[PDB]
Amino acid sequence: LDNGLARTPTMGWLHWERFMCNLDCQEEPDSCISEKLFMEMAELMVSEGWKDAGYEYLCIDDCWMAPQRDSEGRLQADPQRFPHGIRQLANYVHSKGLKLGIYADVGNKTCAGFPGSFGYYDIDAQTFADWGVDLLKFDGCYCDSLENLADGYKHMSLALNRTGRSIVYSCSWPAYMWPFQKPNYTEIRQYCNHWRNFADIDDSWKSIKSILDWTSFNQERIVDVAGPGGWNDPDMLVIGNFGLSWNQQVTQMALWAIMAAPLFMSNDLRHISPQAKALLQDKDVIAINQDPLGKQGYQLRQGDNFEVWERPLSGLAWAVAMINRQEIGGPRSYTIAVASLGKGVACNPACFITQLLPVKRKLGFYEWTSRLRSHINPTGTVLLQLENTMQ
Amino acid sequence: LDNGLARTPTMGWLHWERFMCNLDCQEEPDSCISEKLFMEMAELMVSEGWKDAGYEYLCIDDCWMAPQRDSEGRLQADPQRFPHGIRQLANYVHSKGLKLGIYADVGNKTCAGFPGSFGYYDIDAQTFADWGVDLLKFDGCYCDSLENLADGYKHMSLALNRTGRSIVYSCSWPAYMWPFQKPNYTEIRQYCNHWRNFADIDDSWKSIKSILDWTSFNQERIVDVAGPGGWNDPDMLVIGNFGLSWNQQVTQMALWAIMAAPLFMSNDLRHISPQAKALLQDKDVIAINQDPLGKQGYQLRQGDNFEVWERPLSGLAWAVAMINRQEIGGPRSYTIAVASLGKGVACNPACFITQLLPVKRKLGFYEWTSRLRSHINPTGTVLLQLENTM
Ligand SMILES: *[C@@H]1O[C@H](CO)[C@@H](O[C@@H]2O[C@H](CO)[C@@H](O[C@@H]3O[C@H](CO)[C@@H](O)[C@H](O[C@H]4O[C@H](CO)[C@@H](O)[C@H](O)[C@@H]4O)[C@@H]3O)[C@H](O)[C@H]2NC(C)=O)[C@H](O[C@@H]2O[C@@H](C)[C@@H](O)[C@@H](O)[C@@H]2O)[C@H]1NC(C)=O
Ligand SMILES: *[C@@H]1O[C@H](CO)[C@@H](O[C@@H]2O[C@H](CO)[C@@H](O[C@@H]3O[C@H](CO)[C@@H](O)[C@H](O[C@H]4O[C@H](CO)[C@@H](O)[C@H](O)[C@@H]4O)[C@@H]3O)[C@H](O)[C@H]2NC(C)=O)[C@H](O)[C@H]1NC(C)=O
Ligand SMILES: *[C@@H]1O[C@H](CO)[C@@H](O[C@@H]2O[C@H](CO)[C@@H](O[C@@H]3O[C@H](CO)[C@@H](O)[C@H](O[C@H]4O[C@H](CO)[C@@H](O)[C@H](O)[C@@H]4O)[C@@H]3O)[C@H](O)[C@H]2NC(C)=O)[C@H](O)[C@H]1NC(C)=O
Ligand SMILES: *[C@@H]1O[C@H](CO)[C@@H](O[C@@H]2O[C@H](CO)[C@@H](O[C@@H]3O[C@H](CO)[C@@H](O)[C@H](O)[C@@H]3O)[C@H](O)[C@H]2NC(C)=O)[C@H](O)[C@H]1NC(C)=O
Ligand SMILES: *[C@@H]1O[C@H](CO)[C@@H](O)[C@H](O)[C@H]1NC(C)=O
Numbered sequence A: 001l002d003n004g005l006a007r008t009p010t011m012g013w014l015h016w017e018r019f020m021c022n023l024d025c026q027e028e029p030d031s032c033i034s035e036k037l038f039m040e041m042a043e044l045m046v047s048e049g050w051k052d053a054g055y056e057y058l059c060i061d062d063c064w065m066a067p068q069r070d071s072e073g074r075l076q077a078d079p080q081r082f083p084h085g086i087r088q089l090a091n092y093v094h095s096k097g098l099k100l101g102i103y104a105d106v107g108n109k110t111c112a113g114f115p116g117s118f119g120y121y122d123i124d125a126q127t128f129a130d131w132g133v134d135l136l137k138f139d140g141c142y143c144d145s146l147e148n149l150a151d152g153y154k155h156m157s158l159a160l161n162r163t164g165r166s167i168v169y170s171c172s173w174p175a176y177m178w179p180f181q182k183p184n185y186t187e188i189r190q191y192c193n194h195w196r197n198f199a200d201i202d203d204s205w206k207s208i209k210s211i212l213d214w215t216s217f218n219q220e221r222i223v224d225v226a227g228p229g230g231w232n233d234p235d236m237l238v239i240g241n242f243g244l245s246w247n248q249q250v251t252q253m254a255l256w257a258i259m260a261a262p263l264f265m266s267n268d269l270r271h272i273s274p275q276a277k278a279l280l281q282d283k284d285v286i287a288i289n290q291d292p293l294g295k296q297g298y299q300l301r302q303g304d305n306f307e308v309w310e311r312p313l314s315g316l317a318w319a320v321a322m323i324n325r326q327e328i329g330g331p332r333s334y335t336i337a338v339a340s341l342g343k344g345v346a347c348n349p350a351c352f353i354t355q356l357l358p359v360k361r362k363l364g365f366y367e368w369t370s371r372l373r374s375h376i377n378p379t380g381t382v383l384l385q386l387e388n389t390m391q
Numbered sequence B: 001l002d003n004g005l006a007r008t009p010t011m012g013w014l015h016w017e018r019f020m021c022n023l024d025c026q027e028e029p030d031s032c033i034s035e036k037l038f039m040e041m042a043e044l045m046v047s048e049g050w051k052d053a054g055y056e057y058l059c060i061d062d063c064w065m066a067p068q069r070d071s072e073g074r075l076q077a078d079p080q081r082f083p084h085g086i087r088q089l090a091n092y093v094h095s096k097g098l099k100l101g102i103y104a105d106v107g108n109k110t111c112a113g114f115p116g117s118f119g120y121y122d123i124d125a126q127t128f129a130d131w132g133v134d135l136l137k138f139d140g141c142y143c144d145s146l147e148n149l150a151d152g153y154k155h156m157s158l159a160l161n162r163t164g165r166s167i168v169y170s171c172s173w174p175a176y177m178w179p180f181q182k183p184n185y186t187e188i189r190q191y192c193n194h195w196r197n198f199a200d201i202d203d204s205w206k207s208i209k210s211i212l213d214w215t216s217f218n219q220e221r222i223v224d225v226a227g228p229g230g231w232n233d234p235d236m237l238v239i240g241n242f243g244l245s246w247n248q249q250v251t252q253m254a255l256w257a258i259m260a261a262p263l264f265m266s267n268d269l270r271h272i273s274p275q276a277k278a279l280l281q282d283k284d285v286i287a288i289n290q291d292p293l294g295k296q297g298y299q300l301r302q303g304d305n306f307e308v309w310e311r312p313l314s315g316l317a318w319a320v321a322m323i324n325r326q327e328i329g330g331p332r333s334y335t336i337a338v339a340s341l342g343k344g345v346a347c348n349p350a351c352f353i354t355q356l357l358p359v360k361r362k363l364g365f366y367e368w369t370s371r372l373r374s375h376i377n378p379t380g381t382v383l384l385q386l387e388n389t390m
């Protein structure tokens, strides 16, 4: 989408995976979807380094709305959970140097069942603009046909544009086509800053595997179309939560960088371990994700329960990731010819290799004809950065 | 098996899951299956508190054998990887106050392909007893019929008995039978101290869920047959490795206590986190697993992605485990009437409830009509102990 936004993958925080649609502020006041939750996160995004690391969008997912539109046909914030309204929230978020995302739906209802925007695209567009909304995640639930799905995503795009406000537009369009029709990503990119392709992530290794396997199975179809201002969205980071082992968290952070995915944390910033904080704020790994060239990585090979993925970076550099998919035994030896990496050219005549994950460590110079040997933990990933010696 | 052993479930260390069949001491000398590997583990079992926590059996799984029997038809320890032999390893292990477990197979080969004991039950049994072995894990690969399986398992039981040495006998008998026939756990209990019921565990949440799910489904068949001298074996503890979140690890420790499972660590004692060590050596949770009553627990109810399991204990006590099976979102509140627990007698007229996992905490007294509310992490487990007030 040629709106000047998302020139690198968007970074921020999204409430959904961790907090979902908890509307019970009587029993669970510290975890229900309320203005207070978001004010608290915005404070922590500044004070604990998230903004500095580059996480700047603070994003409301589903279940912020009141059940009914108002008399003028507008979506209303829920009055008991957001008593001061979205405008005041946006102002508060803006006063911290952060940006506000919000959620709406292309069809008649949101997935959680609140008012959808079908029949109100322009009004909802105007409302968000006026409130000072900086990003819109637009879901594809309760949409009766694919014609109506496309038209809606397009109409809202144009609507957002006509407001004159810069708003990052995140679509779920191709996800709700699959596997009923073949998305045309040239069309989709004309209208969207990013797009979800696949099923909802959850807090599981099954989920991460399934997203990586789906992406590599479909990479020939979706990798080339991504770039500055138009990205593949494989959904949230679930690092720092409950259901992934440390090695599986690293795999996610490594592969989200390789994939040029937007980086939306979904966790509790009030209760996050120093290790998860460290991984999510890893400067070198974020730098890979935020590479200005915006060329999305891909799976180079699979075999023997190993996976090799690689991403072309700027400055004649490459990021390479090796995953161990064997979920039994110990760390496993993997050996690859550096001549196979970077389409032959990463290490011609030589390259310097730095391990970034799971720990940072310089490996040294590797000549074109040589071999790389790593030990990779079960469900873990080694992330390497290759620097050609031609500069 | 009425041999005086396994009066509470056996606790120890077993190499398989973490170290597998790594024969390459050229490239990976510190992780290949060798005598040094077991000697180190043995040193650490003493120095790092494992033996004191209760873990006493150090057990070699598959891939310790040379490819051929010797000229007298005996199995032999691989000469490169066990140059000093199994006898000297046993003496070393014994000298630390520990006990040696070893592996063999009822069929013609082991699962890794080394010599099986079919045709050599008496000789192998004698070999092991002469060597000073204290436990035998007997696998069921490469058997051609279910009769030979049952016969084999039975024969070896008698053979070990005939040696006159105390040897804990672990059978994979029913695991290998289940695809074709319902096992006779009354028969199996007669010959074995424990029996593996199901597919091999791995370092994954999927695996663990599938063991609990299988065990709960089949609990009417297997729960009551277990007791002192004869246990259900849901396979190895995999806490301290790679594939499980902290919450998932707590779930394993908890349910393995509820199920009165033998507790066999399969990890690297040389490289284990303090948090994993603390969980595995948790005295109060071990105490539940080692309850002298030896009645195995069971799933009380499931629903709404929750499970409640309970286990009866000596002294009118009960252990209760609540599992959150929803793998999305945050800690989830669960409310249960204590009157539902312990067949209605757990808190009649009242009980004192202590939380043991994930953190030890006293929750006070509870009348028979009162309700308990806990917050359970996704894939995590809260484990409680209930003391009746009579
Ligand atoms: C996925 O979606 C995209 C975006 O819509 C398609 O790309 C577009 O394809 C259309 C073909 O219908 C192109 O239209 C042409 O535009 C050029 C301008 O450079 C005109 O010269 C050309 O005009 C002729 O043909 C028209 C016939 O109706 C008449 O208007 C004229 O009188 C004249 O005869 C025609 O309008 C778009 O340029 C093109 N847009 C982009 C961004 O590339 C995809 O189409 C495929 O991929 C294209 C790159 C190209 O190779 C097409 O030939 C392919 O069909 C579409 N993908 C699929 C699978 O359909
Ligand atoms: C509504 O839709 C319109 C129509 O697409 C959209 O207009 C486009 O805005 C973008 C971004 O502002 C324009 O792109 C710029 O083009 C000029 C040259 O014409 C350049 O100077 C700009 O350079 C910037 O970005 C470059 C990216 O390569 C960088 O190299 C550089 O650092 C600059 O920062 C940029 O390329 C585009 O030309 C217009 N298109 C048209 C036809 O007007 C508008 O922004 C939308 N409005 C909203 C609010 O969404
Ligand atoms: C080979 O097989 C034979 C036959 O099964 C087996 O002999 C059995 O040994 C057990 C235990 O040694 C005997 O059971 C004991 O009986 C005596 C006498 O009444 C009791 O003292 C024992 O009670 C104590 O220990 C019990 C635990 O088993 C506790 O329940 C109790 O609290 C006591 O502390 C115990 O009941 C059993 O009598 C014989 N069986 C027969 C048929 O004789 C033998 O041990 C096996 N040999 C080898 C080497 O495996
Ligand atoms: C391990 O391998 C050996 C070697 O093959 C197996 O022994 C063989 O078992 C077969 C089939 O059970 C026996 O065949 C039988 O032959 C009789 C005729 O004597 C016939 O009436 C039966 O119907 C059957 O076909 C065979 O005799 C026997 N051979 C030897 C060398 O003893 C053995 O069963 C295998 N053990 C296990 C547990 O898998
Ligand atoms: C919403 O509902 C109306 C009537 O129930 C239907 O005609 C319309 O097509 C629906 N819109 C979408 C996009 O699902």
Ligand SMILES: *[C@@H]1O[C@H](CO)[C@@H](O)[C@H](O)[C@H]1NC(C)=O
Binding pocket: B184, B186, B187
């Ligand atoms: C199981 O085995 C026992 C002991 O051999 C025997 O008495 C009984 O009949 C068997 N019962 C079943 C389930 O067939």
